[PDB]
Ligand binder design. Structure first.
Ligand SMILES: CO[C@H]1[C@@H](O)[C@H](O)[C@H](OC[C@@]23C[C@@H]4[C@H](C)CC[C@H]4[C@@]4(C=O)C[C@@H]2C[C@H](C(C)C)[C@@]34C(=O)O)O[C@@H]1C
Ligand SMILES: Nc1nc2c(ncn2[C@@H]2O[C@H](COP(=O)(O)OP(=O)(O)O)[C@@H](O)[C@H]2O)c(=O)[nH]1
Ligand SMILES: [Mg+2]
Lengths: 824, 189, 52, 94
RNA sequence: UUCAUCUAGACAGCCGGACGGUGGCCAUGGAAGUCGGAAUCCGCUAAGGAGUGUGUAACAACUCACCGGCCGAAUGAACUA
């Protein structure tokens, strides 16, 4: 059945009858199949493989007035709008997960009957509890349980018992004290059952209300007397809390006894064929056959049998409302994290009270794209306020902070849209708490963004992910003329996927990030065929290396001009990492006064304040950790050499001698210069060819080595599966900087340095080593020299250099100080 | 043959002077508790262990330090041993039949009685709760800690225990080989 | 789901074994020499690489 | 105090946190040694010791896990000697 | 052909002890008997190695030497051809 655009508007007004919940399911635990058994059933319509993307599918529910007679939360009426969001399966797609929770309060948790709660289900579970979201479970595939394993009555109940047990555990460890009772129990009718595939589902609560009749037993007592030690005596008719009686004979657990008993009898009489029990048990359960449904046999017959006994939506749509949150009570304890700034502000207080006409606070959680010629939409949650087709909005960029301008475009919305999973529909307005969309913001905002109207109101929370873009790859065009298409297409990609990320490299390569390899490829396919639309190329992301020495040159450097008139004498000595660090941190500035700078570089970093107040230049880029210290007091015309000197220096610091790569922590000490008198033999053309060759020779004597980047990964893994990770760092040199965490949460966070050339596919191995249980936070840490000679094609560093040359098509060997020395 | 021959001279020495002794059996011991009972009496009662070492003592009954070994020799069987004292029995006897109490379950060892357990939370956080899962024991969350749902009879009387079931039992503190080193034979002067 | 007690009775006749470093035969775990004559009944053995 | 081989049991009930120490092998060579073998040797590998110490160690084994069960004095000539590489007391131990 | 166990009570087997210092010297991201080099001590008995392997993130835990219940005469390690 359908509802007109204006009924949606009128229905959305009552935030008490606004159900905003998503999906907490493991890769293939049957969420899509089940969620779409609800569309085919009670799915709202507009007035008249792999889940690559998703949206919030909406459904209607006209509940029982006395069922809402026990709903604890502000709830007015029986006209409920169910704004259901479909969170992706598989891991990596934890970007859509984190973002689908930011635009909801409650969520529907799906679990497999026999595959219980695999790592992905507790991944989604820990993510829901870190968003303060309250959940509701549903054990699906009960058909593959009493068929693919033919499981028995008592055994099946226990199977579910354990499913419950394991979930409550992760729920209580990462639960909220500010919420109270969150772990849903089948004892409180907050965990249904069924088969989205077979088209059925049911709660204990459905039969508690259908058996209060034949017993005079209230529904609160019916379902209480169905879980645990709750038994019955079919010999005297006295429900006893003990499996046996006076004869010591075992009884059936109320649940396995009355409720589940029909089910097995149906299967065997239906599948195995027993027409003498099909029509018989038909009426005993009050099931009615009509037309062609009557003639059906086998597995076809059984599917339709439940479509008359416990149809899907029935107990499913029931619980969604019954116990799950609506903007109302939801935002009323969440508001704190939902707004990152004044939790006592007037805008944050309107959200926590939930005012539909208060200050407009709508956050686009994802720029939902479409075959709208490269243009998207602004899908997000309206915490408070009404979306007016042309309303002026404060596009507060996450960088931006109330007292600034930094990315803030206060413009108005062209058209507005109502979300229907894959259906694009143009609405008028939209009240607070409901999740809607708005076209036009796209050409102003970047990927995600907070929207306000009040300047006092700060920014809201921009996820947290924990997933983070770890993977990396280079993307070069397979045709240099269509490179312009790539630049633009790469921009669109960022906006599309929540945790996807494009960025330029130090090697020129356009490095692309993602979560997993599965993830990355899905992104690349949407990139080469759509976003850009030109044959690409994915190569390993080439690392940057800072050629460096480890001691002062074995002898003084001697380089003379090509006309021969002047020579330069000195020696290069590696600076403390923390001293070259001060250069790149903006403490030892290249724009400072040689005295002020030298006092803080000598008193703080222990140097000779003479050559420290004589620190000539920084390099390269003028801000580089390679400096030239002055120690020449005899050179008359030094002034006609300082300028031409930094010229040939800025050239070697930005292109070394080992294979033409930059350096780091190289303080070249100038001890002499055989100067002339006329700058005609002391011009750039004489001093530059000397200064360059001088630096080189001196370097190959100063004990070469090569510097490669070093990471800092913080893998969030459960203390029990921690063994495997320790060993993947053990295979790719992983010094564990530390290992902190929390007393009550097993999730042991682990810091550990990881060298860039040993993280090329690391995520996959880390994932295969401990299952996807571990979540790595790879954020490049510091620079660290290796331990092999650059002129050694057998040692670590040496092999690198040789491979690096053939790539740029350079001179094979590692040219030394003899090839850069000018002797008599 | 080194130790047995030199031990012959030692064994004979304490037996040659004293006129009070106790025949005590075990096997279900523990070096810790065993050597720690020698500490309760490191001057009142000395513990000496043996075997065929008292079988040469059948040939020792022959020697005749005092022919009254016609009331001691024939009780050679079990992980039994020496209890040297020259103070009154009744007094050291209250003592001896009191230092025997501690052994839990070697996960698979010989089980004896019906295991009836009460259903209340033991105050330990959810660490081994995955055990309870594929073990069949209804559990819930009562103030973060794991709460037992039934006075269930987990393990039966007289069977070969399993590592997973005696692990939870180890955190429930059930150690049933409890007893061990007490008495068998008594004799004075 | 295989009950660790039976996943021991299972390995007793599958993993709990010995392998001849020459013919690879699956001998008893305690065997000292390979019962096959292709390797002249060798004493060189190795426990059947326990799975993980 | 004690840096390495510091087995420290923590025994608390409803808020009241208790500091209880097993004063191990490493804790005794420091409760006896002054600052030259009580600090500044983290970048240093402290393997120096020969000097006689005395009966002060019968009571130093009174704080080390009392699970030995016989004579305090005699057990330490063994523990403090062939286990402690920074002290040889009366060279008879070994 | 040696070598040195054994009715005084072996080998093997089955019953169960296999402790303490001690998460020993450091070394440790982490090393408790089981990543690594140095110490390889006696307190006490029947014994328990600063420990023979399995295992742990390290523990746990399993399991050996040693040592005890029973059984009662060989028959075990090493080499020769
Ligand atoms: C938040 O996302 C972050 C993290 O994924 C991480 O910090 C990542 O590090 C990228 C690199 C950063 C290095 C320093 C800043 C100096 C050298 C740079 C690198 C060059 O080889 C090493 C790592 C890996 C990249 C190579 C492959 C070109 C780097 C780059 O940005 O070019 O950068 C992205 C933006
Ligand atoms: N036996 C059984 N199989 C199911 C059921 N629901 C889904 N499936 C299976 O799971 C697959 C679909 O999983 P999907 O719904 O894609 O998992 P999701 O992406 O996490 O929602 C199908 O190939 C089905 O065979 C069910 O109720 N019973
Ligand atoms: Mg799907």
């Amino acid at each position: 059945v359908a509802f007109t655009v204006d009924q949606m508007r009128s229905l959305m007004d009552k935030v008490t009858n606004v159900r905003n919940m998503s999906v907490i399911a493991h890769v293939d635990h049957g969420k899509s199949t089940l969620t779409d058994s609800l569309v085919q059933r009670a799915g709202i319509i507009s007035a008249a493989g792999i889940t690559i993307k998703s949206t919030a599918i909406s459904l209607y529910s006209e509940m029982s007035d006395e069922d809402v007679k026990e709903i604890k939360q502000k709830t007015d009426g029986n006209s409920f709008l169910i704004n259901l969001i479909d969170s992706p399966g598989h891991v990596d797609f934890s970007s859509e997960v984190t973002a689908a929770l930011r635009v909801t309060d409650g969520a529907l948790v799906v679990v497999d009957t026999i595959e219980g709660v695999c790592v992905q289900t507790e991944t989604v579970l820990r993510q829901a509890l870190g968003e303060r979201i309250k959940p509701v479970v549903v054990i699906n595939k009960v058909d593959r349980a009493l068929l693919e394993l033919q499981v028995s009555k008592e055994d099946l109940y226990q199977t579910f018992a354990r499913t419950v047990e394991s979930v409550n555990v992760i729920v209580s460890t990462y639960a909220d004290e500010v919420l109270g009772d969150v772990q849903v129990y089948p004892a409180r009718g907050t965990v249904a059952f069924g088969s989205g595939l077979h088209g059925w589902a049911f709660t204990i609560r459905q039969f508690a209300t259908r058996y209060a009749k034949k017993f005079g037993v209230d529904k609160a007592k019916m379902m209480d007397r169905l879980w645990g030690d709750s038994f019955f005596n079919p010999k005297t008719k006295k429900w006893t809390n003990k499996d046996t009686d006076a004869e010591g004979k075992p009884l059936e657990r109320a649940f396995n006894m009355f409720i589940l008993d029909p089910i097995f009898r149906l299967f065997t009489a239906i599948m195995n064929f027993k027409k003498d029990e099909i029509p018989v048990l038909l009426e005993k359960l009050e099931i009615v056959l009509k037309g062609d449904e009557k003639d059906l046999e086998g597995k076809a017959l059984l599917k339709v049998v439940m479509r008359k006994f416990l149809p899907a939506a029935d107990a499913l749509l029931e619980m969604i409302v019954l116990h799950l949150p609506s903007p109302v009570t939801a935002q009323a304890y969440r508001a704190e994290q939902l707004y990152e700034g004044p939790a006592d502000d007037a805008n944050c207080i309107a959200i926590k009270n939930c005012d539909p006409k208060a200050d407009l606070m709508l956050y686009v959680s994802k720029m939902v794209p479409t075959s709208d010629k490269g243009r998207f939409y602004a899908f997000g949650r309206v915490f408070a306020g009404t979306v007016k087709s042309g309303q002026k909005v404060r596009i507060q960029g996450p960088n931006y902070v109330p007292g600034k301008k930094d990315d803030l475009f206060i413009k108005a919305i062209q058209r507005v849209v109502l979300m229907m999973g894959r259906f694009v529909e143009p609405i008028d307005d939209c009240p607070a708490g409901n999740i809607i969309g708005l076209v036009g913001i796209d050409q102003f905002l970047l990927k995600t963004g907070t929207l306000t109207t009040s300047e006092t109101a700060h920014n809201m929370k921009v996820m947290k992910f924990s997933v983070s873009p770890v993977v990396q790859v280079a993307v070069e065009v397979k045709n240099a003329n269509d490179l312009p298409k790539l630049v633009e297409g790469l921009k669109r990609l960022s906006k599309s996927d929540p945790c996807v990320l494009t960025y330029m490299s130090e090697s020129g390569e356009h490095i692309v990030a993602g979560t997993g390899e599965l993830h990355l490829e899905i992104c690349l396919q949407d990139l080469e065929h759509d976003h850009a639309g030109v044959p690409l190329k994915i190569s390993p992301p080439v690392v940057a290396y800072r050629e460096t020495v480890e001691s002062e040159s074995s002898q003084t450097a001697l380089s003379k001009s090509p006309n021969k008139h002047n020579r330069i004498y000195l020696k290069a000595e590696p600076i403390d990492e923390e001293v070259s660090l001060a250069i790149e941190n903006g403490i030892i500035n290249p724009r400072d006064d040689f005295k002020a700078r030298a006092r803080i570089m000598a008193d703080d970093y222990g140097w000779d304040v003479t050559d420290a107040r004589k620190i000539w230049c920084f390099g390269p880029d003028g801000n580089g950790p390679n400096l030239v210290i002055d120690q020449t007091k005899a050179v008359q015309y030094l002034h006609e050499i300082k300028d031409s000197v930094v010229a040939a220096f800025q050239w070697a610091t930005k292109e070394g001698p080992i294979f033409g790569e930059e350096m780091r922590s190289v303080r070249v000490n100038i001890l002499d210069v055989t100067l002339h008198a006329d700058a005609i033999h002391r011009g750039g053309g004489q001093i530059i060819p000397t200064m360059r060759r001088a630096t080189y020779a001196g370097f190959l004597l100063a004990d070469p080595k090569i510097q490669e980047p070093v990471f800092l990964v913080e893998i969030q893994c459960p203390e029990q599966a921690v063994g495997g990770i320790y060993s993947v760092l053990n295979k790719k040199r992983g010094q564990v900087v530390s290992e902190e965490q929390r007393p009550g949460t097993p999730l042991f966070t682990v810091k550990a340095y990881l060298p860039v050339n040993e993280s090329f596919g690391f995520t996959g191995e880390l994932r295969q080593a401990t299952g996807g249980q571990a979540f790595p936070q790879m954020v490049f840490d510091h620079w660290s020299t290796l331990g092999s000679d650059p002129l050694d094609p057998t040692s670590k560093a040496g092999e690198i250099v040789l491979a690096a040359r053939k790539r740029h098509g350079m001179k094979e060997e590692v040219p030394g100080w003899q090839e850069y020395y000018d002797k008599l | 043959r080194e130790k047995k021959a030199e031990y012959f001279a030692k064994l004979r020495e304490y037996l040659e002077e004293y006129k009070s002794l106790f025949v005590v059996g075990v096997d279900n011991v523990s070096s810790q508790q065993m050597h720690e009972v020698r500490k309760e009496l490191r001057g009142r009662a000395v513990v000496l262990m043996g075997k065929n070492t008292m079988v040469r003592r059948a040939i020792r009954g022959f020697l005749s330090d005092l022919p009254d070994f016609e009331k001691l020799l024939p009780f050679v069987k079990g992980n039994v041993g020496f209890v040297f004292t020259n103070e009154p029995l009744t007094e050291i006897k209250n003592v001896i039949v009191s230092n025997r109490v501690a052994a839990p379950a070697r996960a698979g060892a010989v089980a004896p009685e019906d295991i009836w357990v009460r259903a209340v939370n033991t105050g330990m956080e959810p660490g081994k709760t995955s055990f309870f899962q594929a073990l069949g024991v209804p559990t819930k969350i009562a103030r973060g800690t794991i709460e037992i749902v039934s006075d269930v009879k987990v393990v039966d009387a007289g069977n070969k225990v399993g590592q997973s079931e005696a692990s939870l039992l180890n955190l429930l503190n059930i150690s049933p080989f409890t007893f061990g080193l007490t008495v068998v034979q008594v004799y004075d002067n | 789901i295989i009950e660790p007690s039976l996943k021991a009775l299972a390995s007793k006749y599958n993993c709990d074994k010995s392998v001849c470093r020459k013919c690879y035969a699956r001998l008893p775990p305690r065997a000292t020499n390979c019962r096959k004559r292709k390797c002249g009944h060798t004493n060189q053995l190795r426990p059947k690489k326990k799975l993980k | 105090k004690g840096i390495k081989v510091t087995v420290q049991l923590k025994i608390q009930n409803r808020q009241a946190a208790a500091s209880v120490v097993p004063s191990a092998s490493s804790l005794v060579i420091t409760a006896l040694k002054e600052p030259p073998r009580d600090r500044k040797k983290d970048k240093n590998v402290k393997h120096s010791g020969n000097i006689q110490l005395d009966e002060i160690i019968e009571i130093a084994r009174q704080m080390r896990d009392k699970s030995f069960g016989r004579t305090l004095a005699s057990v330490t000539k063994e523990i403090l000697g062939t286990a402690q590489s920074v002290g040889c007391r009366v060279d008879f131990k070994n």
